[PDB]
Symmetry: none
Subunit: 94 residues, 2 copies
C-alpha cells in the first residue's frame, strides 16, 4: 500500500485506493518508532520509505480528512499485505 505523511506523522493508507478520490476522508494507520512487539504491529524500516526502524500501529487506526493528508513518502511491499491483514485481524479479533 501507500505510506503518506499526515498532520505530523507517517501513516499507512488503509482505505482502498479505488474510492480514494471519491471521498473527503481516508482511513490510515499511524507509524511510531516505539515498537512494543505486538500482533497489532507491522514492522517497517527505511526500505518502506521511512528513515528509522518503526512499526505500523493497527491499534490506533484513524480516519482523517484528505486536506490533512500530505506528501507520499514510501511504499508498503506487497509481500507485507498478509501480515497487515493479520495485524488488523488480531487487533479486532478476526
Amino acid at each position: 500500500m501507500r505510506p503518506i505523511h499526515i498532520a505530523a506523522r507517517p501513516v499507512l493508507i488503509l482505505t482502498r485506493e479505488v474510492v480514494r478520490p471519491h471521498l473527503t476522508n481516508v482511513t490510515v494507520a499511524p507509524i511510531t518508532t516505539t515498537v512494543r512487539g505486538l500482533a497489532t504491529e507491522v514492522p517497517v524500516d527505511a526500505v518502506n520509505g521511512l528513515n528509522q526502524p518503526s512499526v505500523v500501529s493497527c491499534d490506533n487506526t484513524q480516519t482523517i480528512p484528505v486536506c490533512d493528508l500530505g506528501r507520499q513518502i514510501g511504499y508498503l511491499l506487497a509481500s507485507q499485505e498478509p501480515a497487515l491483514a493479520e495485524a488488523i485481524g488480531n487487533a479486532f479479533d478476526l
Copy 2:
C-alpha cells in the same frame, strides 16, 4: 493564485510546486483597508475580485489546507516583481 480561507481573501505565497505535497500553506491576507506601505501589493478587480484592495505582506500567515476555500482571482505576472520586492522590503 489568490484563494479564500479563514475568513478573508488571501494570496498564496507558497510555491505552487509543493502545494499538493503539503498539508499547510503560507499565504498573505488581503484587506480593503489600505495603510499605504512598501509591504503592500495593490490588487483590483482585474485580479478577480471586484474591489480595490491590498495584499498585506507584513501579516504573512501559514495555515492548514483544511482552512483553504474557493479560488477567487489571479495575480498578473507584472505585479509579481513588486511582490518579490515587498517581501524583500518586509523582511
